[PDB]
């Protein structure tokens, strides 16, 4: 076997996979195996990209026997995996050991589950014909518009409050002041009218927040950054922020936004896409209501 991994605590794996089910449940996940660990990436409509990474120390029997360039790809349907795993991993403290296997290329993804003298073995055939490779919605750190670190619980509560309101179009605000009264909020408009959820300047949920001038070194005060993001991406990310410790916000002048989720724990990084243009001249009325 080229890749092998074993784990005893499947609660972490299943709660990490539950954060991918709102949109990634359909198909077309590109798992990566390397010396760093195990990673899953999902990208639909080329509008949002999610990366969930599993470290070496998470697995107990990581071997990774290879004699190549050390980068092998495989694409498997998520829905088959979810349907297979739904029946197992039942009850609590079932000490279900999961064994991962992949014989390089042309072999199905093999999962072995053992639960109280009862073993299971599911083979997941992959799809590697039209794999265009490369891909990735990456951004350069030399021109980051602003950086923000927020608590996971506050963001989860904000998103779960925003979801049921509606708000098919959402906005992201960034603002810094000289008196350390930093302003950060995710406002939106809906049929209800105007919805404003505000994250205060308290360091409990706004530990770090600075607005840059496109050089990632020159921090400035009194400058406003407007981010027009669709409701779909925020709805998809709401589940991913349900269980977390710290959430990192970072977008550049290009408008693409990278959100890092910390939960040692695993790291989840998601890349977003901004809308082409703001609706007419709305951004003006966003600030005009913000200092109102």
């Amino acid at each position: 076997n080229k890749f092998s991994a074993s784990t005893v605590h499947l609660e972490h794996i299943t709660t990490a996979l539950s954060c991918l089910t709102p949109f990634g449940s359909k198909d077309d996940v590109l798992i990566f195996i390397d010396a760093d660990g195990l990673s899953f990436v999902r990208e639909n409509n080329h509008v949002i990209k999610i990366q969930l990474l599993l470290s070496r120390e998470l697995f107990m029997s990581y071997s990774y026997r290879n004699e190549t360039e050390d980068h092998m790809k495989l694409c498997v349907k998520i829905n088959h995996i979810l349907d297979s795993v739904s029946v197992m991993n039942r009850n609590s403290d079932d000490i279900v050991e999961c064994t991962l296997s992949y014989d390089g290329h042309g072999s199905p993804f093999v999962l072995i589950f053992e639960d109280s003298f009862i073993s299971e073995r599911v083979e997941y055939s992959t799809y590697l014909i039209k794999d265009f490779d490369t891909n990735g919605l990456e951004l350069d750190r030399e021109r980051i518009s602003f950086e923000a670190i927020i608590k996971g619980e506050a963001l989860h509560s904000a998103l779960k409050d925003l979801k049921e309101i509606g708000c098919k179009e959402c906005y992201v605000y960034a603002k810094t002041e000289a008196n350390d009264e930093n302003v950060f909020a995710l406002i939106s408009k809906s049929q209800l009218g105007f919805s404003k959820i505000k994250l205060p300047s308290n360091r409990s949920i706004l530990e770090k927040l600075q607005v840059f001038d496109g050089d990632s070194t020159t921090v400035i005060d009194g400058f406003a950054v407007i981010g027009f993001f669709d409701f779909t991406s925020f709805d998809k990310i709401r589940k991913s922020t349900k269980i977390a410790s710290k959430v990192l916000f970072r977008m550049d002048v290009h408008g693409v936004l990278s959100v890092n989720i910390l939960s040692p724990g695993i790291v989840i990084e998601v890349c977003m896409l901004e809308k082409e243009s703001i609706d007419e001249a709305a951004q003006t009325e966003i600030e005009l209501l913000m200092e109102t």
Binding site: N45, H46, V47, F132, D133, T134, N135, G136, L137, L139, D230, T232, H254, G255, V256, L273, E274, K275, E276, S277
Partner: protein, 162 residues
């Protein structure tokens, strides 16, 4: 690897110089892309004349390494229902480009096999989301296309190769 493929796919053109016969169309589209102006090209002709090959070569020429995340290719093999079309193309066109300062090209192979409502939604998106997003229409049959689509899209005819 190569040398193990059918000659139809083995000899697929990769550059605009590799497309023979339609010299006028190739020169016109080269002049269009040299000025950074893509006026919603529409390609019509008999099968085997090199429509999708020409658009693939053009996308390779004008983008290069941006084909993986800027070109949205839709065809008959993918579901093109009214809701699916409106959602997918609205999400693709409404989003701003990542880093490249160029128009976004969407290729629609076999556009004749879509419903009338889907074609109406597509022709509304063409005129609405056009600041950064362009459209390409490929179809061997024009009777199944809405006449409004043929008006907003510049029609190019692919003659049989001499």
């Amino acid at each position: 690897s190569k040398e193990n493929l059918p000659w139809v796919e083995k000899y697929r053109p990769e550059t605009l110089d590799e497309v023979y016969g339609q010299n006028e169309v190739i020169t016109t589209v080269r002049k269009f892309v040299d000025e950074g102006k893509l006026p919603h090209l529409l390609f019509y002709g008999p099968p085997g004349t090199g429509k999708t090959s020409t658009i693939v070569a053009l996308a390779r020429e004008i983008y290069g390494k941006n084909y993986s995340n800027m070109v949205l290719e839709l065809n008959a093999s993918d579901d093109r229902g009214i809701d699916v079309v409106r959602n997918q193309i609205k999400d693709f066109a409404s989003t701003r480009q990542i880093f490249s300062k160029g128009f976004k090209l969407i290729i629609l192979d076999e556009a004749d096999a879509m419903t009338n409502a889907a074609q109406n939604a597509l022709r509304r998106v063409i005129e609405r989301y056009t600041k950064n997003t362009r459209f390409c229409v490929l179809a061997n049959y024009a009777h199944k296309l809405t006449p409004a689509l043929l008006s907003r899209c510049t029609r190019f005819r692919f003659q049989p190769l001499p």
